[PDB]
Scaffold this active site. Sequence first.
Site, PDB file in Angstrom:
ATOM      1  CE1 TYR A   1      -3.852  -2.217   0.077  1.00  0.00           C
ATOM      2  CE2 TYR A   1      -2.523  -3.389   1.684  1.00  0.00           C
ATOM      3  CZ  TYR A   1      -3.593  -3.346   0.816  1.00  0.00           C
ATOM      4  OH  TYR A   1      -4.418  -4.437   0.682  1.00  0.00           O
ATOM      5  CB  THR A   2       1.155   3.760  -2.405  1.00  0.00           C
ATOM      6  OG1 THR A   2       1.424   2.569  -3.165  1.00  0.00           O
ATOM      7  CG2 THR A   2       2.156   4.798  -2.737  1.00  0.00           C
TER       8      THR A   2
HETATM    9  C1  LIG Z   1       3.472  -1.679  -5.524  1.00  0.00           C
HETATM   10  C2  LIG Z   1       1.962  -1.734  -5.269  1.00  0.00           C
HETATM   11  C3  LIG Z   1       1.340  -0.712  -4.520  1.00  0.00           C
HETATM   12  C4  LIG Z   1      -0.078  -0.748  -4.259  1.00  0.00           C
HETATM   13  N1  LIG Z   1      -0.686   0.304  -3.537  1.00  0.00           N
HETATM   14  C5  LIG Z   1      -2.050   0.255  -3.262  1.00  0.00           C
HETATM   15  C6  LIG Z   1      -2.738   1.298  -2.509  1.00  0.00           C
HETATM   16  O1  LIG Z   1      -2.011   2.374  -2.037  1.00  0.00           O
HETATM   17  N2  LIG Z   1      -4.062   1.232  -2.228  1.00  0.00           N
HETATM   18  C7  LIG Z   1      -4.776   0.155  -2.672  1.00  0.00           C
HETATM   19  O2  LIG Z   1      -6.114   0.086  -2.377  1.00  0.00           O
HETATM   20  N3  LIG Z   1      -4.182  -0.816  -3.394  1.00  0.00           N
HETATM   21  C8  LIG Z   1      -2.819  -0.788  -3.723  1.00  0.00           C
HETATM   22  N4  LIG Z   1      -2.229  -1.797  -4.458  1.00  0.00           N
HETATM   23  C9  LIG Z   1      -3.107  -2.965  -4.345  1.00  0.00           C
HETATM   24  C10 LIG Z   1      -3.020  -3.770  -3.078  1.00  0.00           C
HETATM   25  O3  LIG Z   1      -1.727  -4.167  -2.877  1.00  0.00           O
HETATM   26  C11 LIG Z   1      -3.916  -4.998  -3.174  1.00  0.00           C
HETATM   27  O4  LIG Z   1      -3.682  -5.621  -4.381  1.00  0.00           O
HETATM   28  C12 LIG Z   1      -5.413  -4.699  -2.995  1.00  0.00           C
HETATM   29  O5  LIG Z   1      -5.685  -4.198  -1.735  1.00  0.00           O
HETATM   30  C13 LIG Z   1      -6.226  -5.977  -3.089  1.00  0.00           C
HETATM   31  O6  LIG Z   1      -5.709  -6.974  -2.267  1.00  0.00           O
HETATM   32  P1  LIG Z   1      -6.638  -8.023  -1.629  1.00  0.00           P
HETATM   33  O7  LIG Z   1      -5.866  -8.864  -0.641  1.00  0.00           O
HETATM   34  O8  LIG Z   1      -7.667  -7.358  -0.775  1.00  0.00           O
HETATM   35  O9  LIG Z   1      -7.299  -8.821  -2.786  1.00  0.00           O
HETATM   36  P2  LIG Z   1      -6.936 -10.256  -3.329  1.00  0.00           P
HETATM   37  O10 LIG Z   1      -7.364 -11.317  -2.334  1.00  0.00           O
HETATM   38  O11 LIG Z   1      -5.469 -10.492  -3.453  1.00  0.00           O
HETATM   39  O12 LIG Z   1      -7.755 -10.477  -4.651  1.00  0.00           O
HETATM   40  C14 LIG Z   1      -7.235 -10.234  -5.912  1.00  0.00           C
HETATM   41  C15 LIG Z   1      -8.082  -9.496  -6.911  1.00  0.00           C
HETATM   42  O13 LIG Z   1      -9.372 -10.014  -7.057  1.00  0.00           O
HETATM   43  C16 LIG Z   1     -10.135  -8.966  -7.599  1.00  0.00           C
HETATM   44  N5  LIG Z   1     -11.373  -8.796  -6.864  1.00  0.00           N
HETATM   45  C17 LIG Z   1     -11.718  -9.432  -5.728  1.00  0.00           C
HETATM   46  N6  LIG Z   1     -12.914  -8.993  -5.313  1.00  0.00           N
HETATM   47  C18 LIG Z   1     -13.358  -8.017  -6.228  1.00  0.00           C
HETATM   48  C19 LIG Z   1     -14.549  -7.195  -6.310  1.00  0.00           C
HETATM   49  N7  LIG Z   1     -15.529  -7.317  -5.319  1.00  0.00           N
HETATM   50  N8  LIG Z   1     -14.687  -6.309  -7.341  1.00  0.00           N
HETATM   51  C20 LIG Z   1     -13.721  -6.202  -8.275  1.00  0.00           C
HETATM   52  N9  LIG Z   1     -12.575  -6.957  -8.227  1.00  0.00           N
HETATM   53  C21 LIG Z   1     -12.391  -7.880  -7.196  1.00  0.00           C
HETATM   54  C22 LIG Z   1      -9.278  -7.732  -7.425  1.00  0.00           C
HETATM   55  O14 LIG Z   1      -8.625  -7.367  -8.611  1.00  0.00           O
HETATM   56  C23 LIG Z   1      -8.337  -8.130  -6.496  1.00  0.00           C
HETATM   57  O15 LIG Z   1      -7.141  -7.349  -6.597  1.00  0.00           O
HETATM   58  C24 LIG Z   1      -0.838  -1.771  -4.748  1.00  0.00           C
HETATM   59  C25 LIG Z   1      -0.184  -2.830  -5.509  1.00  0.00           C
HETATM   60  C26 LIG Z   1       1.182  -2.802  -5.778  1.00  0.00           C
HETATM   61  C27 LIG Z   1       1.808  -3.979  -6.603  1.00  0.00           C
HETATM   62  N1  LIG Z   2       2.277  -0.924  -8.425  1.00  0.00           N
HETATM   63  C1  LIG Z   2       1.725   0.140  -7.598  1.00  0.00           C
HETATM   64  O1  LIG Z   2       2.506   0.937  -7.048  1.00  0.00           O
HETATM   65  C2  LIG Z   2       0.240   0.310  -7.360  1.00  0.00           C
HETATM   66  C3  LIG Z   2      -0.277   1.274  -6.468  1.00  0.00           C
HETATM   67  C4  LIG Z   2      -1.690   1.423  -6.286  1.00  0.00           C
HETATM   68  C5  LIG Z   2      -2.542   0.575  -7.053  1.00  0.00           C
HETATM   69  N2  LIG Z   2      -2.018  -0.325  -7.913  1.00  0.00           N
HETATM   70  C6  LIG Z   2      -3.006  -1.225  -8.747  1.00  0.00           C
HETATM   71  O2  LIG Z   2      -3.930  -0.484  -9.502  1.00  0.00           O
HETATM   72  C7  LIG Z   2      -5.148  -1.258  -9.604  1.00  0.00           C
HETATM   73  C8  LIG Z   2      -6.250  -0.497  -9.069  1.00  0.00           C
HETATM   74  O3  LIG Z   2      -7.434  -1.222  -9.017  1.00  0.00           O
HETATM   75  P1  LIG Z   2      -8.861  -0.603  -9.095  1.00  0.00           P
HETATM   76  O4  LIG Z   2      -9.831  -1.628  -8.548  1.00  0.00           O
HETATM   77  O5  LIG Z   2      -8.991   0.543  -8.110  1.00  0.00           O
HETATM   78  O6  LIG Z   2      -9.160  -0.273 -10.610  1.00  0.00           O
HETATM   79  P2  LIG Z   2     -10.539  -0.339 -11.309  1.00  0.00           P
HETATM   80  O7  LIG Z   2     -11.082  -1.723 -11.384  1.00  0.00           O
HETATM   81  O8  LIG Z   2     -11.571   0.416 -10.532  1.00  0.00           O
HETATM   82  O9  LIG Z   2     -10.310   0.289 -12.743  1.00  0.00           O
HETATM   83  C9  LIG Z   2      -9.802   1.578 -12.825  1.00  0.00           C
HETATM   84  C10 LIG Z   2      -9.528   2.026 -14.200  1.00  0.00           C
HETATM   85  O10 LIG Z   2      -8.604   1.149 -14.742  1.00  0.00           O
HETATM   86  C11 LIG Z   2      -8.878   1.000 -16.085  1.00  0.00           C
HETATM   87  N3  LIG Z   2      -9.060  -0.394 -16.434  1.00  0.00           N
HETATM   88  C12 LIG Z   2      -9.606  -1.390 -15.700  1.00  0.00           C
HETATM   89  N4  LIG Z   2      -9.615  -2.533 -16.428  1.00  0.00           N
HETATM   90  C13 LIG Z   2      -9.065  -2.242 -17.655  1.00  0.00           C
HETATM   91  C14 LIG Z   2      -8.827  -3.006 -18.819  1.00  0.00           C
HETATM   92  N5  LIG Z   2      -9.187  -4.411 -18.828  1.00  0.00           N
HETATM   93  N6  LIG Z   2      -8.255  -2.408 -19.927  1.00  0.00           N
HETATM   94  C15 LIG Z   2      -7.925  -1.085 -19.904  1.00  0.00           C
HETATM   95  N7  LIG Z   2      -8.137  -0.326 -18.832  1.00  0.00           N
HETATM   96  C16 LIG Z   2      -8.722  -0.892 -17.673  1.00  0.00           C
HETATM   97  C17 LIG Z   2     -10.158   1.685 -16.313  1.00  0.00           C
HETATM   98  O11 LIG Z   2      -9.908   2.960 -16.888  1.00  0.00           O
HETATM   99  C18 LIG Z   2     -10.717   1.796 -15.039  1.00  0.00           C
HETATM  100  O12 LIG Z   2     -11.658   2.819 -14.922  1.00  0.00           O
HETATM  101  C19 LIG Z   2      -4.897  -2.568  -8.941  1.00  0.00           C
HETATM  102  O13 LIG Z   2      -4.504  -3.497  -9.852  1.00  0.00           O
HETATM  103  C20 LIG Z   2      -3.797  -2.252  -8.021  1.00  0.00           C
HETATM  104  O14 LIG Z   2      -2.969  -3.299  -7.768  1.00  0.00           O
HETATM  105  C21 LIG Z   2      -0.683  -0.488  -8.101  1.00  0.00           C
END
Ligand SMILES: Cc1cc2nc3c(=O)[nH]c(=O)nc-3n(C[C@H](O)[C@H](O)[C@H](O)COP(=O)(O)OP(=O)(O)OC[C@H]3O[C@@H](n4cnc5c(N)ncnc54)[C@H](O)[C@@H]3O)c2cc1C
Ligand SMILES: NC(=O)c1ccc[n+]([C@@H]2O[C@H](COP(=O)([O-])OP(=O)(O)OC[C@H]3O[C@@H](n4cnc5c(N)ncnc54)[C@H](O)[C@@H]3O)[C@@H](O)[C@H]2O)c1
Length: 271
Positions: free
Chosen positions: A64-65
């Site tokens: 998380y950032t």
């Molecule tokens: C370097 C880095 C920095 C990040 N920083 C942040 C941050 O600052 N804030 C932040 O919120 N996240 C951030 N992410 C994302 C965060 O690390 C997690 O991936 C996120 O919180 C989801 O983890 P989880 O354990 O809850 O889901 P997981 O159990 O690991 O499930 C995986 C995926 O299933 C999908 N999924 C599951 N349920 C749903 C649903 N109800 N609707 C749509 N999709 C679903 C999602 O894509 C989800 O990511 C970052 C990722 C990276 C790699």
């Molecule tokens: N590496 C990092 O530092 C870091 C930091 C914060 C978040 N993240 C990542 O960013 C993502 C944020 O998830 P979210 O649930 O809030 O996003 P989201 O599901 O709400 O989608 C957000 C936007 O992403 C784009 N998008 C989604 N699916 C797409 C597709 N198939 N093709 C093209 N564009 C698409 C769309 O414009 C969409 O509105 C997660 O994967 C998370 O891991 C990474």
Amino acid sequence: TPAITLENPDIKYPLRLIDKEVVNHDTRRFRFALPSPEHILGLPVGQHIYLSARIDGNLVIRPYTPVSSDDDKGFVDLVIKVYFKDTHPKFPAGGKMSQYLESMKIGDTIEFRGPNGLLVYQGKGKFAIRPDKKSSPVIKTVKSVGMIAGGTGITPMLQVIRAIMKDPDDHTVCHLLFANQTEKDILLRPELEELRNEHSARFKLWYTVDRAPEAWDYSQGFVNEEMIRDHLPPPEEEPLVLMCGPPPMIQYACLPNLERVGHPKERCFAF
Ligand SMILES: Cc1cc2nc3c(=O)[nH]c(=O)nc-3n(C[C@H](O)[C@H](O)[C@H](O)COP(=O)(O)OP(=O)(O)OC[C@H]3O[C@@H](n4cnc5c(N)ncnc54)[C@H](O)[C@@H]3O)c2cc1C
Ligand SMILES: NC(=O)c1ccc[n+]([C@@H]2O[C@H](COP(=O)([O-])OP(=O)(O)OC[C@H]3O[C@@H](n4cnc5c(N)ncnc54)[C@H](O)[C@@H]3O)[C@@H](O)[C@H]2O)c1
């Protein structure tokens, strides 16, 4: 010299949850206490932390950032989307860490570690970016920075934006393109628009949404070539282009279109 919390990236620091604010329907700001009111997190701008917990018998670690900074004594703020179970047909279990965090009560603790990440913003246009985890940083100073964020990918961009705007001698201009599913999904909209209002010369702000409301003055749809061309600095100014969002956003909406516009890979970085 404030005391630093994160002194070694391999050590875990249990921090107590002290406040939680609703950002919108699924996203929350979580505030945790540092070990004392005088502590700072110890987080170079651009880097993230990892949370870890045993959830339902499995080890779960997630990055998380923080959107807070080392100017904020005594606390750390995370902005986190909760992925609820019983909601998205492809993911009926929901998200592991996010639902665990949502279930936490004030006073509960969770382990932080960090800082981590290949990019560090050193102020006044200067970015230190490691090609990978085993190499020395390359120091790149620029006049402008393009930023493409999707959903919670906003959080590393906001760290950098805030670091810049704070310093009246930092003349870096940020161009942010922020993508979300619907208007109500635009996280931290009041904060972002406050930044545009206060710092319009150094901050350009644009949105796209998957589905647009009736009256909408910004863009609609996934990130495309036109948006990139019209809302990020031109390749000629040689800006850095930072990206953070869902992997298909990066792979299918950002990279090919950055190429079409003419932004070379050397100038692009994905968080
Ligand atoms: C370097 C880095 C920095 C990040 N920083 C942040 C941050 O600052 N804030 C932040 O919120 N996240 C951030 N992410 C994302 C965060 O690390 C997690 O991936 C996120 O919180 C989801 O983890 P989880 O354990 O809850 O889901 P997981 O159990 O690991 O499930 C995986 C995926 O299933 C999908 N999924 C599951 N349920 C749903 C649903 N109800 N609707 C749509 N999709 C679903 C999602 O894509 C989800 O990511 C970052 C990722 C990276 C790699
Ligand atoms: N590496 C990092 O530092 C870091 C930091 C914060 C978040 N993240 C990542 O960013 C993502 C944020 O998830 P979210 O649930 O809030 O996003 P989201 O599901 O709400 O989608 C957000 C936007 O992403 C784009 N998008 C989604 N699916 C797409 C597709 N198939 N093709 C093209 N564009 C698409 C769309 O414009 C969409 O509105 C997660 O994967 C998370 O891991 C990474």
